[PDB]
Amino acid sequence: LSDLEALRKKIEEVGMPEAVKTKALKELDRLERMQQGSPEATVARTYLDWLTEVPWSKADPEVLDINHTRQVLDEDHYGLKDVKERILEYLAVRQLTQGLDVRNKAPILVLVGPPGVGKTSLGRSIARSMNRKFHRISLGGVRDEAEIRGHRRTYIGAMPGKLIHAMKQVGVINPVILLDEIDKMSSDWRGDPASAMLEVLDPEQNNTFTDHYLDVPYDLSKVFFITTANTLQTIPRPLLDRMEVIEIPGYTNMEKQAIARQYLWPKQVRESGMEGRIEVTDAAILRVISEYTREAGVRGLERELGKIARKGAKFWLEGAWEGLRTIDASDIPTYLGIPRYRPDKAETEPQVGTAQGLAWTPVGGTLLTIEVAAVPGSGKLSLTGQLGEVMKESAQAALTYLRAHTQDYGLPEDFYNKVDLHVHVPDGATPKDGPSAGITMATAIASALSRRPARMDIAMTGEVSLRGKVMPIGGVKEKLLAAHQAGIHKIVLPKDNEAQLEELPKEVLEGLEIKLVEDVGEVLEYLLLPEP
Amino acid sequence: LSDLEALRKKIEEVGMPEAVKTKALKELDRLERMQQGSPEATVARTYLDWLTEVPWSKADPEVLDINHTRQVLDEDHYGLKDVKERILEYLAVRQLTQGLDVRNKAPILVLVGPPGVGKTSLGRSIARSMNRKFHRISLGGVRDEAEIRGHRRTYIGAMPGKLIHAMKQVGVINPVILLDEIDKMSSDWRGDPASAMLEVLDPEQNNTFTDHYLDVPYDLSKVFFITTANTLQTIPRPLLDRMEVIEIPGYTNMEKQAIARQYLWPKQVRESGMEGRIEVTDAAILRVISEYTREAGVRGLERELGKIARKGAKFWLEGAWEGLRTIDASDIPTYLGIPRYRPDKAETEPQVGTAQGLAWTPVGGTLLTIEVAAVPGSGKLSLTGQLGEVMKESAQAALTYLRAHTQDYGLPEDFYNKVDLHVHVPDGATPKDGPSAGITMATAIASALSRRPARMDIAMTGEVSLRGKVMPIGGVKEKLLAAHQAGIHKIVLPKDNEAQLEELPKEVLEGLEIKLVEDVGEVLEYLLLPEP
Amino acid sequence: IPRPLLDRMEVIEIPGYTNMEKQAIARQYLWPKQVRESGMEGRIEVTDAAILRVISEYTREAGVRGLERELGKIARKGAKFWLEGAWEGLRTIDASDIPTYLGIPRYRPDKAETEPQVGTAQGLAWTPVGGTLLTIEVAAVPGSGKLSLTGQLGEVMKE
Ligand SMILES: Nc1ncnc2c1ncn2[C@@H]1O[C@H](COP(=O)(O)OP(=O)(O)O)[C@@H](O)[C@H]1O
Ligand SMILES: Nc1ncnc2c1ncn2[C@@H]1O[C@H](COP(=O)(O)OP(=O)(O)O)[C@@H](O)[C@H]1O
């Protein structure tokens, strides 16, 4: 109203395109009118201000040193040392990540892994090395283009989408932006946000992306995007373009202990301001890993170590008497209350029909159990979790296997006409291709129908054939890592997954007991205590 | 005239950062426009006033010892059992982290608890401990970021958000800002104010928190924020980093009586100007708490004892009869009318099919009167109460268990496909969204389909799994507090939680009589009044 | 009422009056008030039957506001029928000549004459504009079995 004349000068002082200037002129002749009593004038001035608020004509340094990135991803993060090779061979070779634009294979370098892993920390580290401003943005709960693109501006209360809004929070026009929680954009509310990402997906088409608040193709030419794929089950098929998948698996107990001892506990002590007045034994950290965090990464362990540090700080505020205290495993419960988990599952006191499996979850590899009961009925079958049909088909295959071998393991002669079965699975959706732990359900059905107990110390995963074969499956290494974190030793694995076994770290191949199998009956006889 | 000179003197006396001072002086130089017309020299005057009365570089003495906070929590507060420690821990952390290491650190004590139980009193005592100012900010009905951030400062009719008002009323820049009821926000009208909370509420972004009525972002790098929500299942996920919860559970009736005698009833006596003129016997106090209030926390006691004080004021003021009155449990209805709630739950004459379990509702822990109609039909379980399939899944698991124990409880030989079931659960989707009261619905179904009275005054809480084992349930404190709210002495708890149970304070222990269980076959032994 | 304005509030509930209380308040203060309001000073007599007729046939709002309006109408028609001549020293209005001074009775005397209907029930509620019935009605069509709320009420009524 009063500064508009100055606003008239403020437009072209900072470099803006000329179509933007044309639409600003179209929205500019509408001035010289009262604002109050006219919300259209208010939203018009909001648009005029936004024409300047959005970033224009800035830059970031072009440093892409191979050795700098190597050191930044090496010394800061004691973990990795293997995926760092992959990101090196990708980026150091990749002069087409940005700066150079061609119509060829330029993948957006998706990051896949459980929430606990430091893929986001990898984003922080690579952004620090590249010296391009970092900003994540949440995408879960977003299913609308109007929630990602601008809100159509016709009345007061219109704002651009969180993409442009986030790019306003930074002071550059060529950033590297992590897209946190990019797993839940479903085309069910006002179009497909996947299409908005698709125009963004290309390194040159995003330069033509037009908002809805603003109506000009915005400049996305030298902007890199990296996406956090927390889910390891399914990917958006339209987003298949320009993919080279980068996956972060689970962590070994050795690696978790080392990372806790070297670059997480020191910073946790630092956040409390201590100079090292608290020390923790290695066995204490082992107990914290085992009996306090049943996760796939170090996210929960960070919180637990913070709890320990805060308890130590409060105890030290009771008086100045500590040159240094070492917190061994003896007094751990005095800082974290009751131990929240078992040291291992050797005290399970084997159940009857219950089995244990390795399921595919958005938190990556995870140990889970499957429960089945033989209730009288008409041989019907019930499931849990509104399951994907992959596990339903696995259950049907298990039933077919157990119908032809009723007399091989003392199963009832007709259990498909007189006894119904209720089956529970903690993870129901299973967008992962095929049943992740179908053989676990097969074992559970066999144990439940056998009217015999079943050992609970042994995890397994894979699929069953209609002929009783133990099918191969991907991600076996992650499930082995998850079982190792819980300490489950005897792991049953398909004979077809020897390739997955070779790449396992030597910290895994020693403390477990692998069991290569190709028939369901073998797995049945290696867990069921009595055969008849 | 002299008004501009006075404003110049005021802006000279008041200090602020250099950019703010320079731009305020420039907009002061931008005066002399039409005062008695459209806002061009008046909104500028309002801007200058806003910049002059919002405080800059004004603070309070801070905490330098946990001993003073120890005393302020011991006296003028009943102690609050396990929450004696957590606040002291956090304050120790804050005291030790005063060497300017709070940025991107120092979480803010989200205080989850029912409105009745002392939360704002905790904040008031804490503020008194450090000698800080106090000011609440109600955010239970906020839907606009402009109610938090400002608004475009170009016209008259738009004021800054609640935060700027609260900073203005407080004479210093680092008060104890208590954000009321933050969880119950919504995003229905324009925008989403969740990002406003994210920016204001995190250090290293509070100084980055932007204002809109004042174009200059204001710095909250010193405010000891504290936030009291009621539900952890509704706060936005981004508002969980640096958000450590200090949970405040309900109260036992013994604690209610002990605090009524000390802080509540004497406050009412001082309120109605009846100092040392009327007494109340502890029998009357326990009658009041057990018959007139059925809420977690002691806010109801405030109203009830205020009513008693007012009635005493009227009865005295129509003529004194002695110097110190008295009252017992036999004449409470003379002062509060009909006792709304039964003094004891042993006189409930157990009903036919309905069971009653425990739940931690956000308003306060209470009992779900889970009702079951075993209407004859074709066999189906329709579950009302605005609930997801998690309640339906717990229902199906319990139904499976009873199907495994048909003849063990007089149940029909087949009832999954013979009698339809209606299961009304009054909003079981409360915090801990999902089945945390599966055994309650299990015994409800057992009573309903066995035509045997589900014993009342035994309020249970637990989980039923497909096999039948009663697995542990999180939060074995809120459940017991809700158990003792309704004056229930008999409680059924999973055995796997007894290790947690031993950690509970003696106030919740002695007043309750726990009969630990590990199966459903033993739960149906307690609450079935007859043997069959 | 706003929650910020609900603290430090003590509620003093004043629901509507009762029919005999309505007669009593009309006889004690309302009727003399309106009689001196119009300009009449004691030459009109009104029987209690006429008062009850006014109350139960021309007012359904809780209280006396509608009664105030109806009694003002009575006073103004009395201004008619005394202004053109003092025919009588104290004119008496019974239940018979109440529509000569007012409109047609717009409400029934008693609800007992409702002649019970096949498929309707008479509810109760306190709508914050005044108490009222909830004449909830339902229907039974031969179909396949399904419930349909109608009236834009909450799902609790469907429950
Ligand atoms: N592979 C890894 N190597 C080193 N550190 C890791 C690794 N994975 C996780 N971390 C640690 O986990 C912590 C949390 O990182 P991050 O997940 O990026 O933060 P946020 O949880 O806020 O996204 C970091 O401090 C990082 O040191
Ligand atoms: N130990 C205590 N526990 C609960 N309430 C208390 C305690 N001590 C005092 N009170 C009183 O209970 C009232 C309710 O406190 P609180 O719940 O914090 O505020 P609000 O009810 O406004 O949320 C306070 O006014 C306080 O005077």
mmCIF file of N, CA and C and ligand atoms in Angstrom, chain B residues 77-78 115-122 251 259 263-264 267 298-299 302, ligand 2:
data_model
loop_
_atom_site.group_PDB
_atom_site.id
_atom_site.type_symbol
_atom_site.label_atom_id
_atom_site.label_comp_id
_atom_site.label_asym_id
_atom_site.label_seq_id
_atom_site.Cartn_x
_atom_site.Cartn_y
_atom_site.Cartn_z
ATOM 1 N N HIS B 77 4.069 -28.364 47.103
ATOM 2 C CA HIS B 77 3.755 -29.403 46.134
ATOM 3 C C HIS B 77 3.915 -30.745 46.828
ATOM 4 N N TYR B 78 2.982 -31.662 46.572
ATOM 5 C CA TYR B 78 2.936 -32.899 47.342
ATOM 6 C C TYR B 78 4.120 -33.818 47.066
ATOM 7 N N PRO B 115 -5.689 -32.866 32.375
ATOM 8 C CA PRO B 115 -5.777 -31.464 32.815
ATOM 9 C C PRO B 115 -5.903 -31.306 34.318
ATOM 10 N N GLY B 116 -6.550 -32.251 34.999
ATOM 11 C CA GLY B 116 -6.741 -32.111 36.433
ATOM 12 C C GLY B 116 -5.441 -32.171 37.212
ATOM 13 N N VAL B 117 -4.606 -33.170 36.917
ATOM 14 C CA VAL B 117 -3.390 -33.378 37.691
ATOM 15 C C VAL B 117 -2.437 -32.209 37.481
ATOM 16 N N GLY B 118 -1.652 -31.905 38.511
ATOM 17 C CA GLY B 118 -0.868 -30.689 38.521
ATOM 18 C C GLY B 118 0.202 -30.615 37.454
ATOM 19 N N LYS B 119 -0.044 -29.792 36.439
ATOM 20 C CA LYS B 119 0.924 -29.503 35.392
ATOM 21 C C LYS B 119 1.316 -28.037 35.372
ATOM 22 N N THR B 120 0.338 -27.132 35.299
ATOM 23 C CA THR B 120 0.647 -25.711 35.395
ATOM 24 C C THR B 120 1.165 -25.348 36.778
ATOM 25 N N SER B 121 0.742 -26.081 37.811
ATOM 26 C CA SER B 121 1.315 -25.876 39.136
ATOM 27 C C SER B 121 2.787 -26.263 39.156
ATOM 28 N N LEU B 122 3.142 -27.348 38.461
ATOM 29 C CA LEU B 122 4.549 -27.710 38.313
ATOM 30 C C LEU B 122 5.335 -26.576 37.676
ATOM 31 N N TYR B 251 -3.787 -39.807 40.101
ATOM 32 C CA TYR B 251 -3.541 -39.835 41.536
ATOM 33 C C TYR B 251 -4.314 -40.959 42.204
ATOM 34 N N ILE B 259 -3.430 -34.466 50.037
ATOM 35 C CA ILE B 259 -3.240 -33.139 49.474
ATOM 36 C C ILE B 259 -4.442 -32.237 49.740
ATOM 37 N N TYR B 263 -3.035 -28.669 50.949
ATOM 38 C CA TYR B 263 -3.014 -27.544 50.021
ATOM 39 C C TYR B 263 -4.369 -27.200 49.428
ATOM 40 N N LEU B 264 -5.259 -28.176 49.245
ATOM 41 C CA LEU B 264 -6.503 -27.899 48.535
ATOM 42 C C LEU B 264 -7.551 -27.272 49.447
ATOM 43 N N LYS B 267 -6.741 -23.911 50.933
ATOM 44 C CA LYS B 267 -6.868 -22.899 49.890
ATOM 45 C C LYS B 267 -8.318 -22.470 49.719
ATOM 46 N N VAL B 298 -6.786 -33.646 40.638
ATOM 47 C CA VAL B 298 -7.588 -33.150 41.749
ATOM 48 C C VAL B 298 -8.216 -31.806 41.416
ATOM 49 N N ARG B 299 -8.503 -31.565 40.135
ATOM 50 C CA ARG B 299 -9.224 -30.347 39.782
ATOM 51 C C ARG B 299 -10.664 -30.396 40.269
ATOM 52 N N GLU B 302 -11.097 -29.076 43.677
ATOM 53 C CA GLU B 302 -11.172 -27.622 43.750
ATOM 54 C C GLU B 302 -12.623 -27.158 43.760
HETATM 55 N N1 LIG D 2 0.600 -31.997 43.882
HETATM 56 C C1 LIG D 2 -0.473 -31.530 43.201
HETATM 57 N N2 LIG D 2 -1.080 -32.284 42.265
HETATM 58 C C2 LIG D 2 -2.149 -31.835 41.588
HETATM 59 N N3 LIG D 2 -2.703 -30.629 41.775
HETATM 60 C C3 LIG D 2 -2.200 -29.772 42.689
HETATM 61 C C4 LIG D 2 -1.027 -30.184 43.468
HETATM 62 N N4 LIG D 2 -0.734 -29.163 44.291
HETATM 63 C C5 LIG D 2 -1.638 -28.180 44.051
HETATM 64 N N5 LIG D 2 -2.507 -28.543 43.093
HETATM 65 C C6 LIG D 2 -3.630 -27.719 42.584
HETATM 66 O O1 LIG D 2 -4.291 -28.363 41.492
HETATM 67 C C7 LIG D 2 -4.692 -27.384 40.535
HETATM 68 C C8 LIG D 2 -4.587 -27.931 39.119
HETATM 69 O O2 LIG D 2 -3.236 -27.831 38.680
HETATM 70 P P1 LIG D 2 -2.846 -27.981 37.125
HETATM 71 O O3 LIG D 2 -3.554 -29.181 36.554
HETATM 72 O O4 LIG D 2 -1.346 -27.877 37.005
HETATM 73 O O5 LIG D 2 -3.467 -26.668 36.440
HETATM 74 P P2 LIG D 2 -4.705 -26.811 35.427
HETATM 75 O O6 LIG D 2 -5.746 -27.571 36.212
HETATM 76 O O7 LIG D 2 -5.084 -25.383 35.116
HETATM 77 O O8 LIG D 2 -4.119 -27.580 34.267
HETATM 78 C C9 LIG D 2 -3.787 -26.177 40.731
HETATM 79 O O9 LIG D 2 -4.562 -24.976 40.762
HETATM 80 C C10 LIG D 2 -3.103 -26.392 42.067
HETATM 81 O O10 LIG D 2 -3.446 -25.340 42.972
#
